[PDB]
């Protein structure tokens, strides 16, 4: 039974690239011919994986996209030159491993929040949310750090609010909210993957100051 096969997505270089060479010990008696079935082989996405029919080299023909298909299940077939299957179809599983090629994206372009002017600092005001298509499970490619890029107006302070790096909850950072003077704030919030270090997106948090 065939070992787990793994192919990083977004691969460059010359294609196709060998993945694994499948064999039949059922093939010294007979010349075996290999083929594969499954999505990625004969079924959409067709042609992503091929197998050299005389050698049993399974190859990937193009760069993969983990966010499109992370796991391929293919079946190899070993057929005699005489036209008889010499073995049961062998399942072949190809895991596509993640690259950090999706930038975080906010679920909204503009989040709306409201805070009472007298809200004590540390008061949660609102939440911004971002998603990342990359591999939350096995990488930090989907690990999103939220930040506030800017606040307008910068009054009374540059930093009326703060955002929880992890949760995107925005809180009153300081006192001084004054609905009469500054009815509203526009925060530009950033979501960066790799835990803030990676790829970035921005969104607006419009925060209305209430009585």
Number of other CB atoms surrounding residue 55 within 10 Å = 13
169 forms beta bridges with 127
Q: Is 35 helix (H, G, I), strand (E, B) or coil?
A: strand
Please, are residues 150 and 207 in contact by the beta-carbon 8 Å criterion?
no
What x/- string results for residues 141 through 180 when contact with Ca ion is judged by CB under 5 A? x---------------------------------------
* End-to-end Cα spacing for the chain: 69
| Identified binder of Ca ion from the candidate list 193, 200, 203, 205, rule CB under 5 A | 193
| Identified binder of Ca ion from the candidate list 50, 98, 125, 161, rule CB under 5 A | 98
Q: How far is the CB of 4 from Ca ion (least distance, A)?
A: 19
Nearer residue to Ca ion within complex by CB, 144 or 173: 144
Number of residues this chain uses to bind Ca ion (CB under 5 A)? 12
Point out which span in 19-27, 87-95, 132-140, 178-186 binds Ca ion (CB under 5 A): 132-140
Closest-CA residue to 177 (of 110, 114, 116) = 116
Looking only at residues 47 through 66 of this chain, which bind Ca ion when binding is defined by CB under 5 A?
65-66
Residue 41 binds Ca ion (CB under 5 A): no
Looking only at residues 64 through 93 of this chain, which bind Ca ion when binding is defined by CB under 5 A?
65-67
Burial (0-12, 13-18, 19+ Cβ within 10 Å), 131: middle
Cis amide prior to 70 (ω within 30 degrees):
no
| Identified binder of Ca ion from the candidate list 134, 162, 190, 201, rule CB under 5 A | 134
Please, are residues 29 and 120 in contact by the beta-carbon 8 Å criterion?
no
Q: How far is the CB of 41 from Ca ion (least distance, A)?
A: 20
Closest-CA residue to 135 (of 189, 81, 98, 168) = 98
Nearer residue to Ca ion within complex by CB, 98 or 185: 98
The response to whether 27 counts as a known ligand-binding position is: no
- Alpha-carbon distance of 27 to 47, in angstroms, equals 26
Q: How far is the CB of 96 from Ca ion (least distance, A)?
A: 9
Residue 136 binds Ca ion (CB under 5 A): no
Binding site, annotated residues for Ca(2+)? 101, 132
Q: Which stretches of the chain bind Ca ion, using CB under 5 A?
A: 65-67, 98-102, 132, 134, 141, 193
């Amino acid at each position: 039974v065939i070992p787990p096969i793994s192919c990083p997505e977004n691969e460059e270089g010359e294609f196709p690239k060998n993945l694994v060479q499948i064999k039949s010990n059922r093939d010294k008696e007979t010349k075996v011919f290999y083929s594969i079935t499954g999505q990625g082989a004969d079924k959409p996405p067709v042609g992503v994986f091929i197998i050299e029919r005389e050698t049993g080299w399974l190859k990937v023909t193009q760069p993969l996209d983990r966010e499109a298909i992370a796991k391929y299940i293919l079946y190899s077939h070993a057929v005699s030159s005489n036209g008889e299957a010499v073995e049961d179809p062998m399942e072949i599983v190809i895991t596509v491993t993640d690259q950090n090629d999706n930038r975080p994206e906010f679920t909204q372009e503009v989040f709306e929040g409201s805070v009472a002017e007298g809200a004590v600092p540390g008061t949660s005001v609102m939440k911004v949310s971002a998603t990342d298509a990359d591999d939350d499970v096995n990488t930090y490619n989907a690990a999103i750090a939220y930040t506030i890029v800017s606040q307008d107006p910068e009054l009374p302070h540059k930093n009326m609010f703060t955002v929880n790096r992890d949760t995107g909850v925005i809180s009153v950072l300081t006192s001084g909210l004054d609905r009469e003077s500054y009815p509203t704030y526009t925060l530009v919030v950033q979501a960066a993957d790799l835990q803030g270090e990676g790829l970035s997106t921005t969104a607006k948090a419009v925060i209305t100051v209430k009585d």
